[PDB]
Design an enzyme around this catalytic site. Sequence first.
Site, PDB file in Angstrom:
ATOM      1  N   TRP B 100       0.945  -1.231   0.099  1.00  0.00           N
ATOM      2  CA  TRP B 100      -0.018   0.118  -0.085  1.00  0.00           C
ATOM      3  C   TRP B 100       0.862   1.257  -0.032  1.00  0.00           C
ATOM      4  O   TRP B 100       0.387   2.193  -0.521  1.00  0.00           O
ATOM      5  CB  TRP B 100      -1.049  -0.050   1.314  1.00  0.00           C
ATOM      6  CG  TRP B 100      -2.205  -1.105   1.018  1.00  0.00           C
ATOM      7  CD1 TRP B 100      -2.461  -2.132   1.773  1.00  0.00           C
ATOM      8  CD2 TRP B 100      -3.035  -1.052  -0.104  1.00  0.00           C
ATOM      9  NE1 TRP B 100      -3.318  -2.851   1.256  1.00  0.00           N
ATOM     10  CE2 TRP B 100      -3.917  -2.248   0.104  1.00  0.00           C
ATOM     11  CE3 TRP B 100      -3.248  -0.126  -1.209  1.00  0.00           C
ATOM     12  CZ2 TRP B 100      -4.987  -2.378  -0.734  1.00  0.00           C
ATOM     13  CZ3 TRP B 100      -4.334  -0.503  -1.896  1.00  0.00           C
ATOM     14  CH2 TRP B 100      -5.136  -1.554  -1.762  1.00  0.00           C
ATOM     15  N   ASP B 170      -1.602   6.977   5.886  1.00  0.00           N
ATOM     16  CA  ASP B 170      -2.590   6.128   5.324  1.00  0.00           C
ATOM     17  C   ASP B 170      -2.805   5.187   6.434  1.00  0.00           C
ATOM     18  O   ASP B 170      -1.962   4.191   6.753  1.00  0.00           O
ATOM     19  CB  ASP B 170      -2.176   5.250   4.067  1.00  0.00           C
ATOM     20  CG  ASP B 170      -3.297   4.106   3.568  1.00  0.00           C
ATOM     21  OD1 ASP B 170      -4.063   3.868   4.383  1.00  0.00           O
ATOM     22  OD2 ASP B 170      -2.663   3.610   2.716  1.00  0.00           O
ATOM     23  N   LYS B 194     -12.091  -1.159   6.951  1.00  0.00           N
ATOM     24  CA  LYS B 194     -11.289  -2.164   7.647  1.00  0.00           C
ATOM     25  C   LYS B 194     -11.878  -1.773   9.152  1.00  0.00           C
ATOM     26  O   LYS B 194     -12.142  -3.172   9.899  1.00  0.00           O
ATOM     27  CB  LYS B 194      -9.935  -1.910   7.614  1.00  0.00           C
ATOM     28  CG  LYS B 194      -9.321  -1.609   6.304  1.00  0.00           C
ATOM     29  CD  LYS B 194      -8.882  -2.804   5.241  1.00  0.00           C
ATOM     30  CE  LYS B 194      -8.773  -2.651   3.742  1.00  0.00           C
ATOM     31  NZ  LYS B 194      -7.633  -2.010   3.352  1.00  0.00           N
TER      32      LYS B 194
END
Lengths: 355, 358
Positions: B100, B170, B194
């Site tokens: 990511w 993030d 999430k």
Amino acid sequence: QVFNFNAGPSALPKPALERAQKELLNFNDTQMSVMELSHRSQSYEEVHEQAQNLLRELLQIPNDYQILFLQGGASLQFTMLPMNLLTKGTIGNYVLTGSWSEKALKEAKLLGETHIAASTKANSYQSIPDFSEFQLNENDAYLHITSNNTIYGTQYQNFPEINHAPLIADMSSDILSRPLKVNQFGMIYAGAQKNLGPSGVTVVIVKKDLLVEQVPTMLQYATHIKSDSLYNTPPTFSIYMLRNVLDWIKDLGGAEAIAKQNEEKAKIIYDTIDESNGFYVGHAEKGSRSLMNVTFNLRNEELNQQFLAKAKEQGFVGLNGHRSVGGCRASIYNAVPIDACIALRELMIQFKENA
Amino acid sequence: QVFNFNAGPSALPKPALERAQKELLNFNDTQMSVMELSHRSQSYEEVHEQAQNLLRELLQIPNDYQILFLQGGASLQFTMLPMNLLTKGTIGNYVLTGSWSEKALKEAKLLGETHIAASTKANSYQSIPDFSEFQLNENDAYLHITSNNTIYGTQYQNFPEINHAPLIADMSSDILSRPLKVNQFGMIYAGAQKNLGPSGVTVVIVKKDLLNTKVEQVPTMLQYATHIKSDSLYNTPPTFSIYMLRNVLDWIKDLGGAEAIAKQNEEKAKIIYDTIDESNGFYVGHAEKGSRSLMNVTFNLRNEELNQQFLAKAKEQGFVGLNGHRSVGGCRASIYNAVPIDACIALRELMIQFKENA
Ligand SMILES: *Cc1c(COP(=O)(O)O)cnc(C)c1O
Ligand SMILES: *Cc1c(COP(=O)(O)O)cnc(C)c1O
Ligand SMILES: [Cl-]
Ligand SMILES: [Cl-]
Ligand SMILES: [Cl-]
Ligand SMILES: [Cl-]
Ligand SMILES: [Mg+2]
Ligand SMILES: [Mg+2]
Ligand SMILES: [Mg+2]
Ligand SMILES: [Mg+2]
Ligand SMILES: [Mg+2]
């Protein structure tokens, strides 16, 4: 008694919501909510595919078009479209038929050359312009229209035959309210929250071969085409709800059946206006009247406010016109039932009789 | 028996779902679903505001920060951040601690100069680099990190003190899993799906004065200023997702907030890492111990046949989501806030029995 005339987000079909409620904790015997599924699960992928399939069936979308489910609303499409198609030396050509047309044009002007093919702005967007008036350019990248001008209460009765560049339509407020000849378009887009589902997903129907170095990955149509709208995590519950709404449209007989219901709904409100001896006056020219958003006013602002206050007292929701124009707006998207339109008529007749 | 270890979207706390079910058709006595309301209604405005206020209280967000609710996922933030802050002459500086991280860097590269401050790529992202390793530039537009590297199962234990440029994170896979000192950051972003409930909304916590100014040339929807000025109601928001976020945040508060959820998350992670560590190498965790994530536990068995057999047994036994990310294989137990401790107990028992019977 509550009558939901909201303009966006909006009424949904009772069966679609009841179905969602019943299985909210245990979807398809998985013992999980659809909201708790991986988007890479077969369970979710089936729903994702079934929403596409039902759209394809209901709108009779040819195989050479792809169906995308994107985030960001129609407003993100105002920029994503020119970002992909408004290339150097080309023109983003717009037909202005209301404020939503104007907002789309504005975003294209940030990215390249634009043009106004035709416009009824000078007459306060009371009608759709004659196609014979369109000013087209050889180097048009596209011609963009707004099929249903949600604030002004006007709608395209039919669509122009455009062969020099793709025809692109913001159909947010009338998609799948009637049959469509999708082959007239290069692209159709719509936020779901008026006719298809709840807010949070945008349907984009795009001619595959139409659609970019330098464009961010998430803002390329190609990214979403190649990944089947699974490049990143989709709005899974919104697409599930879309599927449920599409099942409801299919169960009632599809696009021709919903068109008949929507024409009857609109007829009730327009006949009430037309028989009112001028007490209610519609904004739209009769020949351009929308079947989705009925805009009208009473003879003065005081009466407008009195009527809207009485409607609110009697359980009607959403009838205040858009701030930018005032008056009244009855939004009668697919899932607004005929009995709500009857109730609005009856309120309108009583209000006039007691004025 | 179903044990939900899905990696995204993921388990929700049952009371948030039960609440949503009960009022799905008649929200706040309106006789409409929250999904059928105007975003300008008092009923929706109350939800939108309460979601912000719960996040503010739970994370102790200072008053000079605003909470945005955006569409597009964290992935859209990978481009929106450099579009707004990566100006001519500046550098988007990235710490690479997993896939990511790489995806975020890739989007910045399309828009301006980039740099890699530090990276554990060469060692397959087994750890977080020491902050002493960070290569900083005077013309950094920002320094971007990924707090929890969801695919690799590693996590920052704490955050660097950066004064030359804003620190951006993030935090998709670990936001509100523990207390956070938000004032270390200029911006924090997270897809909600999430640890905060719904897909379809992205939470962006922004230091207002860093991002509230128009950015010439940037489309309206892609300017943070648009969303700051309009309180995330510039266009139609994802109302049901924000509603569900509210419901999840109410649950976190009810259980004791960030401190309490951290205690719960440490306990249930320890159940799984102890199982791995007591397995005499039958299970091998990917992460170095000092970098082990509390949110995603990544591991392999001794060969791919055993990995396949374990995962097939898990599925037969009702476990969902344990296959590792496609890009790396192995196994991944996602144990976000709402995954119950008894699912972790069940996973331990599965792992012990499979070992013993192999
Ligand atoms: C509803 C509407 C929009 C705005 O859609 P968002 O999803 O809020 O961006 C755009 N175009 C038309 C014609 C609309 O009716
Ligand atoms: C889930 C995840 C993403 C991708 O989020 P989308 O909403 O799918 O774009 C980005 N970053 C991290 C750390 C993730 O875990
Ligand atoms: Cl309009
Ligand atoms: Cl509107
Ligand atoms: Cl990662
Ligand atoms: Cl992931
Ligand atoms: Mg008009
Ligand atoms: Mg059916
Ligand atoms: Mg008649
Ligand atoms: Mg409480
Ligand atoms: Mg239990």
